[model samples]
Target chain A: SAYIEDFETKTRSTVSVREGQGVVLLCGPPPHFGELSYAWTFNDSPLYVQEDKRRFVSQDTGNLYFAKVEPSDVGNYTCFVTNKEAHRSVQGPPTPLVLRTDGVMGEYEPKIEVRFPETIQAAKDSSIKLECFALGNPVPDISWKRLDGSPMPGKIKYSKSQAILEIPKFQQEDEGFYECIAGNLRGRNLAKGQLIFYA
Target chain B: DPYWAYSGAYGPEHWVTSSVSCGGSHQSPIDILDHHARVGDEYQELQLDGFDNESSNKTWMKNTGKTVAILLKDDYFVSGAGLPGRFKAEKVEFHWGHSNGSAGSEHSVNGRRFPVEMQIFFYNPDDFDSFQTAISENRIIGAMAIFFQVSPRDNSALDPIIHGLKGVVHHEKETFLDPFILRDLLPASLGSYYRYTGSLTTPPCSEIVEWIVFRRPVPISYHQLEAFYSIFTTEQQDHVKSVEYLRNNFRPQQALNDRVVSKS
Candidate 1:
């Protein structure tokens, strides 16, 4: 028996960016039957631009913009559509505000400096601080790892170098390589600092 | 948040067909060549005949010209110096055989090619620039290959390269640092080596490197050679018992194209 396969080219977006800047969300060849009719919903509901200042709002560009951008702006951005059938919504692949704000230069370079905290043995009961930091145009993020490198297994107190990385009470287990990643929009940093814990 | 390594259908086979990356115009390795004299007093004149084996598959290099290596190495001697994002060493891989079109390696060592050649691969680290910051940049990260003549002599380091093959192996991590282990295989004599860039012999055909094929043949025993083949075939736990699948994965030598090959 001969079978015929019918095909239709419906609009679907996979959401990708140009790495650094020029990060634009691609929708489709203009929504079929005039799609972008109402205010776009971010995540799911509520107008992102509201009826506020004209920072950069328009259905003309498909998705609403947070304007010039910043690192805190990285998250899910979506556009919704409605008609006679169902409320069809189009969510763009996470166009990280980081990619746009830092512009490919935001990823941090973490250079791990592995070392043993010298005062740990004497301060068994006392808390120790396993510190790590990174340098970059927009400052990098930092984190701590156990010697085995399986995330630290207990309640951990932390602070950040302005949200970079933070550790309040350091335990004996937090004694291996402490990595400090610093990055901006140009590229990412895979550098780390190893800090070993011992007497 | 979507890394090419993550989103693309996991593993090497899916790379090309799966992603929009590496479509075309991506770079490939260039070959090196040695030719007769010509130059001002600044560039030294020298002869570069096919070094040894009588095969047409010979390439040459000579430093009689510059200070820095004309051949590339030590660039990504660590990591990230080559590729863009995160990847690290999950394992070190190797391949071997004598002669091309016959069995192993895509390259002919020295002048005499081997039925199989060996290549050691150190996987990219898991996190960002893992290859760069962790292994590629690791002092220990290196790829060593050995060429065995049909019949050989008592060469210094060559003996051990054959010795390491004593155990059927593919180390998932960087192990066996009996210091100078690599030194034992490389020739005591150092000269300007012919170097060009090339990709891994397998698919996904990444050209993220400049290969420095050492200009000397390392010795190996016939028994050792057979042992290498045995591991690739006989020792499978999967009971696949298939040697044919292990046989040839090498690609034909890519063209030297218009690229320059360096020596020194």
Candidate 2:
């Protein structure tokens, strides 16, 4: 909506670096307008500036600097431009910034922290939740599967910490062992629990 | 008679006043350190004769306010398995918790307690004419302890006993138990056990018993365990209704002194 016939936008680029490395981002070609102010954001949130200038700082040359980078520093970075006239504003296309570790992507494998509802017994046409939690350097992703080397059934919901299996119409086939699978770039691990349906 | 209760002034801590043996060197129900127990193959297979006999036998199942006890026929007996001699089976009883979550076993494994504990009392028939005589003479008695844990499936061996609990809901009231095999109540494997010299866990606290506790636990359904909690104390119902469930009846762990616990 903040567009004009004379104003123009350019294609943005991306930057990648290993974890624990320094980074510098260039806003791009100076605007054709008179005087302008710059603002930066990461993952749509404004980066802390005035409070911790040593960690993150903005220079007069329209650039941002991070002294030491971390895995969390990886995300989309954006720059906003404001004219001295205080009449118009422009936001540059977001630049993708990726931070990678030197060795294996996720050096540490997923380690389970908790698995609850050790044994579940439900009535016909009921629902149950089997929870699991894990930790990893890259924060693992969780999934669910059956113990008989078969795929999980439909009507199931999954998240990073738990799997909710819903049985709108329960059947004898629904009773069995269910396994929680957690994986990351490094490796994967699993835990098991049982589901019983009573008449 | 100076009665001893599981809690308050008559609790185990004050049991010393009843008998000096209550504070004796070797006590019953000591915590078992699995790895440290001395292993041996001297324990032969337990010889439980006439355990499967079905008869009208007039077996009594009673609620003693503190626990549930079953008096067996004098004809039933057991021997072998490192026992000194043939012992006449006398009575069977159990100690349990208020709920499945709380521990009830008198003895612990590496300090971990189970939900229920069962003890079957037998006296050395060679030295005594009756169980009371053995107790009165301070002669050694034989006791077998079995721990019970909560499971989801029904235990066929305990079905009759669990069902009979309904008839003896009140203390002092008793019912005739149907014919059932005593061996069925024992763990499948009788080769492994912890044997030590200890005392009776009740008021007498007599230090005249040899305890043989099985290492494995018997399975009982959660629902069955709740039935045990339903039993109310014999105290007048008009007062003290809330603290009535026959629970937490198990004695605390006792000191081992310089005794060694042998395992098989």
Candidate with the greatest lDDT versus the true structure: 2
lDDT of 2 by residue, B20-44 (tens): 7778778787899988888757776
Candidate 2 CAPRI assessment class: incorrect
User: Which sections of candidate 1 miss by over 4 Å?
Assistant: A1-199, B1-15, B18-32, B36-92, B98-103, B109-112, B116-146, B154-164, B169-180, B233-245
Q: Write the per-residue lDDT of candidate 1 for residues A16-47, one digit (tens) a residue.
A: 22132112232232234333443444444555
**Fnat values, candidates in order:** 0.00, 0.00
lDDT of 1 at A34: 33
Q: What is model 1's DockQ versus the real complex?
A: 0.01
